[model samples]
Target chain A: XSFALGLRKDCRAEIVEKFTEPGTVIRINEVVAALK
Target chain B: NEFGLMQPIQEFKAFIESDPVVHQEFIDMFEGIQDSPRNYQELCNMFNDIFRKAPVYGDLGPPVYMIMAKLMNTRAGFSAFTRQRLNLHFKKLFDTWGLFLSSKDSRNVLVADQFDDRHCGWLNERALSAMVKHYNGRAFDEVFLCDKNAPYYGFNSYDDFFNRRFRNRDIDRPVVGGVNNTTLISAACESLSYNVSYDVQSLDTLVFKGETYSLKHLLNNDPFTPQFEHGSILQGFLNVTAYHRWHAPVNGTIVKIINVPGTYFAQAPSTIGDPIPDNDYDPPPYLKSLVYFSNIAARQIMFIEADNKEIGLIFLVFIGMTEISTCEATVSEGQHVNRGDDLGMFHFGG
Candidate 1:
């Protein structure tokens, strides 16, 4: 499998702040859905 | 001197007889040195000798030698090569104090330190520019220092910081006792000369007699933009002066004097463009008024040009003059003067 590109500090924080299941591995396709 | 004991004289004869072309070239190079003209060939030979004898940079490949040979083939080569060779010639010069945290050893430091200062002091931008332009275009692929980097923690330890930051980077290479980069290969066009005599604390008192007075002050006030760093203070200032004039930058009366202690080197225009770590010392204020005098020949003219508003001064230097000692100042200090005043005259020829 292709490794994901490293996330910057801001990008990482944005994921944690937006999703309830922040600790789960979010797939690329699921990113937008989880950001609600 | 006994003629027979001078057996080396026969070696000279054998050298002349073996290759008349090379012999003539040798004479031509030596004659230029004798006449005080720039001699690149001689400088190259000198460097070749040093490289052969010293263990500093062992047996650089043919490519490196070829590059160095090209570097020593032109006037800029003469300037850079001579400056480097001269420093090597006289070890004491490197011992002269420079910006702290310099990685150069006593010998290399002296050569590298004064290369820009004294050489630039003697030559003009026009002359230097022409030479540098030619040399950079024609010379070697790279010029590497013969030293290795030795960490120095004095002052802000910027030298150490940069060394550590770039330690693992492939761009970093140590030779002799210092590190170098390809950036040194660029041509330096804009030029300025600094008076090594000014004090850092008394920078507020810097001024030229007839020109803009507050220019130096204004440049010094900005710590961020024009902030003067210690190691490379001239980075913030680049003022040109005529060979004959001594005018002020502002209308203010010349006041306190402070003699900053350190060895002086010619301000290389190329170094100004490079980005390096900054040191804490503020040099912009004291450096703004600095001027460079070209060594080429010129005609006699008034030395200083003062402003009518008593704000700034301009220099009217003549590089072509032979007997420069005879030129006298026309204006006296404290003499109220208007702009474009004839400050003095420089006699060009005998």
Candidate 2:
């Protein structure tokens, strides 16, 4: 029934350097490497 | 319309025909309004008045979702006045439909043998194929625990097949680092990753597609809600073919289990950029309002106190969409579970 149910297409697997690090938005240019 | 959406309508008509009482009850449901619809034309009149559209019987019969989709758009569809009536109508519809799926009669869709030309029918072919391909060459029996010799591929009912467990959890889906790894968190379910928000607020204005999630609302103002404020949240959805059961993401002690009672199919309406040249609005598949669903939809929230101190209070919210009425929890509060341990399963509904 969920065949064509407008699902978003984004898969992510990230390894954060710190678990309790304060959240911050990293701009596209500041990123190190893309998972894909 | 696709067969997947159309088949349920066909089966519904068959179900009505199979029972005289059900037929009369359905007629009564339609007749509740003034100038009761006596025929297809009259029903179309009633439909057009409420939905502002003609009845679409498709090739097979009336698509139930067609009515549901239209109902969702109009104020008369989900208002308290209409909802009371709709609740009764859907209750009767789903009650009978549930019995049918539970019975052996529902096994036809699961057939995948050479005799069937349709190629594994609908559920197996159109749906399960994605999961099959995701696993990379693993056969059905190899991925799930099932009796290949038994009927419905060892499933007693459609729900049984829907909620099949991994054949070998250790090998088929090993925990991230042999269940001892607290640094790496495994996925809670085999689902489509929708949104992963960091530093989620405790309370936020719930908009259509604006906000990813609000912890206070999603957790239903639980005491633990404050603990997750400004914390991270990973939200996703399980399609019809994805595994229904959720697994523990990290070695944790289940601190609290909250099953929130919420609207079954209440969705936020989202509009595309600009109206198309041919139409005033965008086409169907507005089901992407998952961010809205995470707050309002019936869901199960688990506050798992991870064994690792760094990954302390990690909570998971499993929000169920349309047709997913029951969000069952198999584990009790304070129970210890390792990463990849079976937590519970969402019953029915894609």
Candidate 3:
């Protein structure tokens, strides 16, 4: 119900490994809320 | 070679033994019988053995037995031997039945089509029916169906569906339908029909001979198919009732004038999240008259009149009623009324 963002020290590496380079990433936040 | 009758009993026994409270009590009762000091492990084994071999002592229905087993196993409150306390607890259980049964009947009877998984859950009908029989001091008036028209036709266990829908919120997703099943829908429709018929019958019985003030319909506003932002029919019903009782809770007044508005929510199992909007409904008033229903049925009312010296604030509580009704006094700022006076009456429409 409630979500808090956790920051990783190595942003580039974390983003490449966890966020990008995956089969597909459907970002709910992006869909629900557009970027400012 | 007959197993149906025995099945109920065995199921009853299993239900009782499954409770942690019952398990602990059985262990304690046996530990007292040991001659030499029996270790916890040995005591547990002895307790389990006796439980496995123990015969059903009396013909108490499964509901009563389940609750009693729960109470006994805990041993924290009064024992079953204490008639008054036991009856009090029993009465609470009975009231739960009234609420549960009425809700079930109302939902099933009135709004069968709208019944969904969120509102209907797997209920042990035999145990529930047995409970009703035991509490009323009579055998079940009708047969209870276990699997008939239960919500979610393919599901094997109602408990699993209930657990997922309620605790996990899996059913909240758009596609899940909250586990609504045909049985639940039918049951809800049946329940509503029963409620209306029962209400009419009660009025007929009361007014049969020649009783003035025979019938009065106070509230009958049920706004179904409203937008999600408009709250819900159930919430509106609760809100109107809550507003009416605001005066009685403050001072001990027997106000009889009240209202039961709206067709009950038809969704399966009727989750609050689906109907009640967050930050829209208040819980304080409902909490005040928590014991009123049980106490009233027992022909007594429990109240607490207290004042905080440091805070300089006074408060009163009336225990009863499904929701809180607040009664505010306009006369002399502070006044008291005797019990059974003109508090207010609740009204419901056909």
Best by DockQ: 2
Please give the lDDT score at residue B157 for candidate 3. 30
* Candidate 1: Cα lDDT at B100: 24
Which residue segments of model 2 deviate by more than 4 Å? A1-36, B1-67, B78-100, B113-128, B203-205, B208-211, B272-285
For residues B1-350, could you state the per-residue lDDT of candidate 3 as single tens digits?
13222332344334436757644543453333444224334422332332222112122211223222222222332221222422333333333333323232323221123224322122333323422331224322122222335443223332122111111112211111122211110000000000010011012222123221111111111121111111101001222101122122112222222222211101111111222212433322212221111112122111212121111111121212211111222323234432112233221101
Q: Candidate 2, after superposition: displacement of residue B150 in Å?
A: 3.3
- For model 1, the interface Cα RMSD in angstroms equals 27.8
Residue ranges of candidate 1 with Cα displaced over 4 Å? A1-36, B1-327
Worst 10 residues of 3 chain B by lDDT: B185-194
Give one digit per residue, the lDDT tens place, for model 2 in B1-350: 32232333445455645656544544544433334444323433343342211111111112334344433443333342123333433434344445555666556656653334423443344444555555657876788888767766777766677778888766556664566555666666765545556566744566544646776788889886676665555545554456777777767899988876655545554532222133323334335556665775666777777787666666677776555545677888989998777788776432
DockQ, computed on Cα atoms, for candidate 2: 0.06
DockQ, all models:
0.01, 0.06, 0.01
The predicted structure with the larger TM-score, 1 or 3, is 1
B177-246 per-residue lDDT for model 1 (tens digits): 1112111111011122222211212134322332222222322233321222211111111111112222
Query: Which stretch of 10 consecutive residues in model 2 chain B shows the poorest summed lDDT?
Result: B52-61
Q: Rate the local accuracy (lDDT) of all candidates.
A: 0.24, 0.52, 0.22
Q: What is the full ranking by lDDT, best candidate first? A: 2, 1, 3
Report the CAPRI category for model 2: incorrect
